[PDB]
Amino acid sequence: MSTLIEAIVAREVLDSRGNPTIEVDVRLESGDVGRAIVPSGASTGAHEALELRDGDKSRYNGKGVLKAVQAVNEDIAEALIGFDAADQIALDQELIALDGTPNKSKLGANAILGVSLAAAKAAAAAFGLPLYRYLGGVYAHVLPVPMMNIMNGGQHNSTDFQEFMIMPVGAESFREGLRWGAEIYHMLKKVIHDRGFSTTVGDEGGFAPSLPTNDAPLQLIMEAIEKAGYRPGEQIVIALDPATTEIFEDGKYHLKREGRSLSSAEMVDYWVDLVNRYPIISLEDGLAEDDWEGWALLRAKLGDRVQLVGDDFLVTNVQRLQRAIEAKAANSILIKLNQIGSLTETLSAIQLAQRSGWTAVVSHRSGESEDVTIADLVVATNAGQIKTGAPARTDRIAKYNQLLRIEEELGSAARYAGRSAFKV
Template sequence: MTQIQDIRAREILDNRLEPTLRVTVETAAGCATADVPAGRSRGEHEAVEVRDRDDRYSGLGVRRAVATVEEQIAPQLRGRSVFEQRLLDELLVEMDGTETKSTLGGNTITGVSLACLKAGATAASQPLYRYIGGATTSTLPIPFFDMIEGGELSGSALPFQEHQVVPIGAESVSEAVRLAAEVYYELGDLVAAEYGEASLNVGDEGGYNPIGLTDPRDAFDLELRAIEQLGYQNAFALAADVAASQFYDPDTDRYAMMGTTMTRDDLLEFYEDLVDSYPIISLEDPLHENDFEGFAELTDRLDTQIIGDDLFVTNPDRIHNGIARGAGNALLLKVNQIGTVTEACDAAQLAARNGYSIQVSERSGQTADTWLADLAVGLDAGQIKTGVTRSERTEQYNRLFEIEANLGQAGTYGAGSSKNQPFGSAGETL
């Protein structure tokens, strides 16, 4: 019942109308499919995607990846048990033979690994989150909502990529999503009134794009006003995905932001002022992706969560380096950054053992596949980042609603993150 009978793949479209990969693994217990996400804001140390680079879809097609799955990978994995996830993933890594997964493709490997995982859950007659986390899995993650977008995700002039609201004062996922939705509606009214109806256009993850807004502090002010007008001050804190590599110039070692340039020290002082002025509980990628020293200094200076995304790229080797140097205190986990489920879970366990919090994250290119929600619960992560609106985002929330209902009284909202106290004293509501 658990042996792989066949592995198939096809080219599908993500939310940006760009091709991605859907992989199907067949056993006697049934078929399981997994869709592969794709990032727009990508770190230089991530696993490499294989794209066709021809005339179709401006070179973004994945027919090569489909052929790799069916002609190279499937013959090697047929007959093996889907319960042997680590062995299957090790075989994929061995077949590829490169650190960046450039032979088979990170997207190809991710699709096969995830489809095998889902096939294992099907064969075990378990929901995916239970198959990942075991019988005691009970943590429902705190969602980080990207209400106003900038950087690579939008057409606005804001340097920070995401300006987030975080419902840490909610008592359940369903309440957290409801409160955030109401803030989103209220924020839309403020944005339209002050920046025009065109500013209600959204970025890749559903956040607003206020025209003419260039200062992250103005974005946070808008979010605070929406929260306060609803009387939800006791429910929310703020956070940001800075994605600083996007406005860093390695030639000058300077950050270009708000019409000026900043040194690392200038930027660290800016963050200190920002956290002093706003109830910010988390900063993601506040410095460029190779600045372990700067991350360590900021982690020491601020009593808040400092997340490594491009810094760590879900890679155990880079996480080891960060731990040794005291760089950051939280990991952004993206399976397709490293390639396989096993490597991603190893990264999460390494981070958690060393007191780092885990935030499971989507990519800007998503489909309606909801394995991300199950992964966040199964890993006991306690935090999830999956955008705001658009169906590929809201389907993750709908899946969390289902899991919450299945867990019933056993479910605990945000318990995974609170164990490590990731937010420090800043983890207070407004």
């Protein structure tokens, strides 16, 4: 096939926020070239892969990526020219070995992921296989139900909770499900203005108004689902990302707009009440980063009927995930490629969660790009769920278009996750 690496070149490009990022090109003996743009975004922690920014305040306010570009054009290229790109595992374990650090701090998670991803793409093109087939094999065919970000809050009048998303569970295909969501998001754009507010997008595309209650965004969403012609529960469900680790502050959980506080036990009580009122199927970071005792209590009270997704709580970390699997601290994990740093390690987290009865929710980043790897990765692993944001900005829309293509390409083999995406 001639899958041996000939060239590894990197350049500094811009992300969806206009911040510098790394784009890597892996050229094979065959002549095939794989290209990858690496994302970023938000304040995350608790043992994660570190990306390499320049720190040169005279270029992009210190956010430059040239040091990472160097690591690829020199260090990585020297080590991998002549390596077989068709050996993803061996390559990723060569990239990890070359770095030497456990958090990919010497070369950068961004340089390692760039090469990790471009290598796979280069190889897929060499075999003449679509990326989802190359990655997941002959049984890669499940189109995910998207968690579409139609409404925003948290911190940039606010709002205590951050993300309010809709899920087209009842649709027959990804194509129809994307239409439903698009239609509802546009109905919410009509409803918002027709209630006395403004309508411009965010970083994903969600509308961020100034509301009086925490139940108001759920009430508005319910109206937009109905006035669009869709049945709540049966056709459309709600997925929330309150990102409570933001309002934690030395124990208690501070609800400024509701003038309340309490402990994890009463924070759990709040979710149980809200879940009984709205068709909420998923809740991500309902409790804080390290409130491990709280998480298990939320699992016991809602885990039988609500998908509880570890985001900042699990940070796509295989050691944290193994603890949360054992502890019974959640039933779902949000997957971010650049939080772990390699394609092999990502697939390992996805498989560890999936084989433990958990669901893996492949997520995008705040600063995305024209790169649509997560669309082929979500199908390759038959994840059944994707978090890519509003059907608005091309950062988000590009992934939706790739899922439209993957579905078309699969033909009769294509199968939409539907209610099967969930463990409920």
